[PDB]
């Protein structure tokens, strides 16, 4: 029968590893680097676009940074198509929670459910796992500003600063070096861009090869604002920190 | 070799190896004999034990008041098939107030076994059955093989060393077929038939199993001290 052609995606190796999860992580390590940095007064999301072409429409483009609701955003590393399947599920899950409890969904709850979906693809169903790692950046009134990451295994962890995708080893060492707890958003913006600038496989970091976002309480009084940076705004912030 | 992974695969010479391997399980099974006259049909079965502390695996199963079989091979598969026969005999009685013809019983077993040899995932039944019965057309004896092949006979035998009894019955054909209106003599002929398949072991009181059905005899099984008469 069909047994002959079954890859058996949801099995253990003799060493106790999940083949497909390990190979999905290997895939993600070639994707453009994404960095999240959590400050005391906000969160920064910075991501490098995968080798850009000059004829690519940059302003009406979305590849790395997506909005889940008004309080939560994600940075993607891996297959974009896979990420969008999961993003739409996450968006729906947030609206289900809001409909049920009349309160915006706590960040961890959303992260757990999305991570539980990924877990399912590694234990049953015989399908390939999602080749995606997320950085979740969000705010709620319980824990305030939070950074999480999830990967194809469905395992998630919380962070002060974290990188996914390419050159995470080098990027994490640089973040671990210059990060400190009393940091502000504007400092975190500078750290994020500096780290990408050093870890990048490109010749020089420019505005057209970046996506950028901040989640501040920089609105008017006790409320959170999401800012997905426009091309010109990334061009300005890159000049302001003296990278170009 | 490369064509015995499942039942759904034909070999290059047109063989079904899984069906043949199922047939092999019957050859390992203990010998059982079937034979009939015009008035009665008799099953004789050599039972097998695990050791001297164990019981002797029961070989004969009743299907209805007028029908039953003996088994050789996987006993659980015989239980499944006998249970199916019980239901089919019972359906015939409840719905049509009709005793199921022994020939139809064979046709039903054939078709049930066949479906397991053409589909992916399943396996052939690993047991051979000798069905005896008395219906509106007199006494009958059938031989079921898990390939699906059912065959009506005057006498036969299946299991290990069944060729000895099968040869004997082939010689005795003209004698035992005319043992009409005499149960004890037809059994004696069956007990002598199964004796041609014995090696180093002989028929004891908790070793021998006999069943009989006929004109004025419901399908009944004899074990223990009730078969001491025939040793």
């Amino acid at each position: 029968g069909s047994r002959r052609y079954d890859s058996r995606t949801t099995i253990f190796s003799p060493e106790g590893r999940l083949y497909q999860v390990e190979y999905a992580l290997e895939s993600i390590s070639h994707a453009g680097t994404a960095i999240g940095i959590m400050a005391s007064d906000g969160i920064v999301l910075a991501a490098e676009r995968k080798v850009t072409s000059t004829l690519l429409e940059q302003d009406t483009s979305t590849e790395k940074l997506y909005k889940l609701n008004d309080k939560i955003a994600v940075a993607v590393a891996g297959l974009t198509a896979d990420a969008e399947i999961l993003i739409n599920t996450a968006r729906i899950h947030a609206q289900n929670y809001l409909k049920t409890y009349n309160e915006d969904i706590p960040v961890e709850i959303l992260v757990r459910r999305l991570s539980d979906i990924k877990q399912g693809y590694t234990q049953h169903g015989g399908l390939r796992p999602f080749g995606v790692s997320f950085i979740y950046a969000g705010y709620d009134d319980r824990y305030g500003y939070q950074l999480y990451t999830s990967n194809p295994s469905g395992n998630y962890t919380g962070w002060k600063a974290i990188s996914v995708g390419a050159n995470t080893s080098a990027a994490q060492t640089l973040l671990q070096m210059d990060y400190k707890d009393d940091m502000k958003v504007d400092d975190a913006i500078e750290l994020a861009l500096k780290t990408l600038s050093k870890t990048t496989d490109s010749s020089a970091l420019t505005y057209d090869r970046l996506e950028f976002a901040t989640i501040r309480k920089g609105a008017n009084d006790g409320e959170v604002y999401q800012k997905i940076f426009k091309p010109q705004e990334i061009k300005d912030i890159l000049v302001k920190t003296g990278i170009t | 070799n490369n064509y015995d992974g499942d039942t759904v695969t034909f070999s290059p010479t047109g063989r079904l190896f899984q069906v043949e391997y199922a047939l092999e399980a019957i050859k390992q099974g203990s010998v059982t004999v079937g034979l009939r006259s015009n008035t009665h049909a008799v099953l004789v079965a050599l039972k097998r034990n695990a050791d001297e502390l164990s019981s002797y695996q029961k070989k004969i199963i009743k299907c209805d008041e007028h029908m039953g079989l003996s088994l050789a091979g996987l006993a659980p598969d015989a239980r499944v098939l006998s249970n199916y026969l019980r239901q089919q005999c019972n359906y015939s009685s409840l719905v049509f107030n009709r005793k199921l013809a022994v020939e139809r019983a064979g046709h039903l077993l054939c078709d049930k076994a066949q479906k397991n040899t053409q589909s992916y995932g399943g396996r052939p039944y690993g047991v051979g059955l000798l069905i005896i019965g008395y219906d509106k057309s007199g006494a009958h004896l059938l031989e079921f093989q898990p390939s699906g092949n059912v065959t009506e006979l005057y006498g036969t035998a299946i299991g290990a060393r069944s060729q000895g009894a099968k040869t004997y019955l082939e010689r005795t054909l003209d004698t035992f077929i005319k043992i009409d209106g005499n149960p004890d003599e037809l059994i004696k002929a069956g007990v002598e038939a199964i004796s041609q398949s014995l090696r180093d072991e002989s028929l004891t009181v908790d070793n021998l199993s006999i069943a009989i059905v006929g004109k004025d005899t419901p399908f009944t099984i004899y074990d223990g001290e009730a078969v001491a008469k025939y040793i």
């Binding site: 409909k99 049920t100 409890y101 009349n102 309160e103 706590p106 961890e108 709850i109 009134d141 319980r142 | -």
Partner: protein, 195 residues
Amino acid sequence: MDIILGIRVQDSVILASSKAVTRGISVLKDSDDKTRQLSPHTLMSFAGEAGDTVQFAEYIQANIQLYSIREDYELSPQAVSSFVRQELAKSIRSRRPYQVNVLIGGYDKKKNKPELYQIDYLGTKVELPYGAHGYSGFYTFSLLDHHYRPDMTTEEGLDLLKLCVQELEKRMPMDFKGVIVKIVDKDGIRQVDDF
């Protein structure tokens, strides 16, 4: 079932619920507690169809307790009331709806405010300073319209509640065998034993 009242004052929510369980021409019990604690600072009283009431209350209780263990966190009264309303809103278009009316009294620890929600079996939610289900409302609402003030203490709320129970005992046809009173505030839920 029958009489369930609720009064929100300055610093607490007070729930009163009748003790009688009647079936036919027999009062089977006169000490019935028509309430469940959903969480340490959230109490729900209930009244309606026999069987349905307790089955629904305990089902909600189990769900809120499950949430609390999962998140190691207490849901706000507003969040609990919205969850309860949605369950009743689903129920009304089921094959057999829950015929249960509830009052949810809670103390929001984040806001430091008492909150009273009235929800009927259709899933009709309203936040109120004082609430009642069934025929009780036909006496108590007008009474509380007159005597209630928003800045009252828990003691003043209990006296205001005594005034309601007295009116009901005077004018209601059925003997409801008094009420069990419970207070929900910053320190949680406690029962008044002498009422």
